[PDB]
Amino acid sequence: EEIREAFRVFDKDGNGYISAAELRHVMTNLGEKLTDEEVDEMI
Amino acid sequence: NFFTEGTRVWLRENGQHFPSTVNSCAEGIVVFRTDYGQVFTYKQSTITHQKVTAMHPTNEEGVDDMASLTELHGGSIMYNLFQRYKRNQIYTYIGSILASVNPYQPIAGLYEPATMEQYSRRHLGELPPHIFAIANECYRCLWKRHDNQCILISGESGAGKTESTKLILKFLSVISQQSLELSLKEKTSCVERAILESSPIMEAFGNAKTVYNNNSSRFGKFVQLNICQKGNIQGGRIVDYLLEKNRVVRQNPGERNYHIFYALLAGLEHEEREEFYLSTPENYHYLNQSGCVEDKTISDQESFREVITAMDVMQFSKEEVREVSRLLAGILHLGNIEFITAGGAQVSFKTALGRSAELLGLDPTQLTDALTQRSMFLRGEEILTPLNVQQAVDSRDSLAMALYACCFEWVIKKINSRIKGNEDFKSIGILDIFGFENFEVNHFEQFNINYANEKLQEYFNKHIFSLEQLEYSREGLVWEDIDWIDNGECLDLIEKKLGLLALINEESHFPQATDSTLLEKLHSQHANNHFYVKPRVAVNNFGVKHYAGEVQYDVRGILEKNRDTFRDDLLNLLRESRFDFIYDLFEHVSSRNNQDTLKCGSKHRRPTVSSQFKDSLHSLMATLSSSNPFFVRCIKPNMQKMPDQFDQAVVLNQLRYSGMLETVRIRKAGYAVRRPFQDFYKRYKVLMRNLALPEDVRGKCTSLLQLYDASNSEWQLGKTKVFLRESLEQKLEKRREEEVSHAAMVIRAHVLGFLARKQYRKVLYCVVIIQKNYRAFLLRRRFL
Amino acid sequence: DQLTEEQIAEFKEAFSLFDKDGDGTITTKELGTVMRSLGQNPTEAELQDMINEVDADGNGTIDFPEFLTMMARKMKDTDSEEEIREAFRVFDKDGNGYISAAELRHVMTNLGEKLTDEEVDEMIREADIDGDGQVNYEEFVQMMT
Ligand SMILES: Nc1ncnc2c1ncn2[C@@H]1O[C@H](COP(=O)(O)OP(=O)(O)O)[C@@H](O)[C@H]1O
Ligand code: VO4
Ligand SMILES: [Mg+2]
């Protein structure tokens, strides 16, 4: 359940869809960089 | 008192101070040449200090505010206006009072929308004097002051009151939008567009050519604009005062009837013109009698187009426009009815009668009978009595006037219906009266117009001088009283019990009374009144010493004009109209038939023109008395309607009688702005942030004011209020605006940095919770 | 003065978020948004004066080094617990510490900068005292830290 809270605020769409490429652009540049290898698996 | 050749001096030549140059000073003779071309010669020994005084440096190419003048006299004031007039600067301030000299020509850029925008964003005094600056100050007062505002525009016929009103309305319409939101669909459907379009309609129906003005206002107008708290116009109301209905049937030589008749005849298409049996204006008695004419149409054709457009904006249906056209055509044909005596009045030729009866929806034999005979019923059979030709002409003309006056009232109703809106916050009222007029021959119409001008001058004096100096006295200010010429006694002569109106009204109620019996009473009662003039030879006249000059009135016509009788026979006839528009106008109209007692000497009496007008003016002045006023003084530079022609004698007269000299004195020395100590302190607290303030409010006010003027001359503390000059208040309002705006920037920047920080911290949190959860979900999936 | 490695790293984080293009350049419009995201609340004026220095040519871009400089500059001022409090206090009248949402909305829309009503109504309806019936500024100032 502790995921749906952080995805309902992760889009400007306001229709339950977090435009793919934008999520990839969020990670690695973030507070806890994920070496893009973790990012290749969240696709 | 000796001045060398070429010296600039004021030469007092007993009447006024002349701007002059020393032409020569030799052999004990001094010659002065005035800037108006006059040459005055004197023995040098006879010249004393004023006779002659030195002229201040350049004075200076003019001064924007006459309170800045060094030399204060009529000569000085006029010269300032003259210098400015010569360079097309028609506006000059006297504090927040505005002087406007009619240019009688367009001045490039003066009233352009780019200029309106520039004035909307500045304070009074930051730009050259302009009517737009007054309209803006007035508008700003809706948030600076707690009351409604009004703009009162004074001046003789042709001075520029109507043009001034239109400019104020145009400016306020523009400023109203600002206050959001645009779209051309909005701006063409607009309440402000409708308010602006009321002018061409009202001018066509209520204005006419007179000797003093080709577009003379023949009615008084009070426009009230209702403004909401957000700053936009919600709607309005127009109140009309005493339309000159007699102009419909007769005009003095060289004048015209109402513009609308000429516009209708010049503007209608061939088909409608033929439908209403209309031809040229020369063919109509109601348009041809003055001999003017003197125009090859064209200006009237453009006015028709302008009216039609305005009526469309005003939501007059195409049928309503045709109905008004049909009524006006009916009036024109009605005027062409001629009578002959054949026991007694008889309609001579049937054509004009037939056309008028058709257009008015009346039966021609019924119309003929109503104009030529009077009806009486006796228990209970009808008795028809013939009228004589004078009575038939008076009936025809009373019918024409009734139709026009009712149509004008309906048009005003329609305008008011269109501009109707809420009254949620405050209002700005603008008064455009018919101006002072003194013709070769003056009748009752001029008496009423001049009375209204007199009543307005009394309001101007009450507010500028009387109440103002009374407030200074009550508040215990250090003040030297300024004298001023009060016209109160002239109004007393007109208005008091046994006064001019009282005697006119009393004689009107006596059927046996004539204009000659009235004049006897006027002379007997008022010969010794300082403001009344019993002519030494002119047996049909009486004079009134109006503020703007002595006017002689011919009594012939006063009783009949004041009575304003309309036969019940004619009202009954109109109610027979098959044309619904006409019936609707007369459906509930009150009877105005001639009364013949018996023993009905009872206190009421039927309302007369005078009594209804005195009431309306009193109602108006009472409304104005509760609003904060702005004054505009329109000055006619000449009597020839000419541009670039400043008649110094004509101008000086207006400056003198209107009290401009005394006005400059009180605005230079006085304190037009005042606020209770706490109110002043609470408003300007922002400006005291860097000051070491005392515990008492009087001291707090002093601390700020001392920074602006340590001499204590531009402000004073009264018993309860801080008094300050308009210039100082304007200086304080500009600085308050600057600090308030700077404070809004400080908070606008701090909240924007709160919102962005909140969402940046939220995104940084939402990701660290998904990154920790994915680091776990993928570590379990790696173990499988 | 000096910015600690932890500080520089914290700023490159916020920079890279707005640097979608991945070129190491954010737009002039974004400079405000980024600085604000990191604490610093520059005024529209302060922001323009910063741009006019960096971006004379009119390219509309800001590299990380020129941003860092803008940051360390605004960091020096310092003003102040009673400075925002003083700006809000001009919006009174009675010294009660109360400014109405009506004039506060007017400050946010008309004055300062013209901004989206849907974001400013949420900035009021959520960030307001008495739940509905007006806002306390000294509380809001304290909350704005
Ligand atoms: N501001 C002005 N600029 C140019 N011409 C003007 C101005 N004011 C008046 N006039 C001219 O003088 C005429 C008389 O002015 P108007 O306002 O109609 O007179 P009144 O004071 O009698 O209402 C105008 O209709 C116009 O031709
Ligand atoms: O010409 V006037 O509008 O002053 O009557
Ligand atoms: Mg007029």
Numbering used by the authors:
A (entry chain G): 83 to 125
B (entry chain A): 3 to 786
C (entry chain C): 2 to 146
Sentences from the paper on this structure:
Myosin X is required for filopodia formation and extension. These conformational changes in the motor domain are amplified by the myosin lever arm, which is comprized of the C-terminal subdomain of the motor domain (known as the converter) and an extended alpha helix length that varies with the myosin class12.
We thus crystallized the motor domain of myosin X in the pre-powerstroke state (with ADP vanadate bound) at 1.8 Å resolution, as well as that of the MD2IQ of myosin X at 3.1 Å resolution. The PPS structure differs in the orientation and position of the converter as compared with other plus-end myosins. Comparison of these PPS structures show that while the subdomains of the motor are totally conserved in position among the myosin PPS structures obtained to date, the myosin X converter is rotated compared with that of myosin Vc and other myosins. This is not due to a conformational change within the converter as found in myosin VI27. Instead, a sharper turn at the end of the SH1 helix, (at Gly672), allows formation of specific interactions between the converter and the Nter subdomain in particular with class-specific loops of this subdomain. Our MD2IQ pre-powerstoke structure indicates this could occur without steric hindrance between the CaM and the rest of the motor.
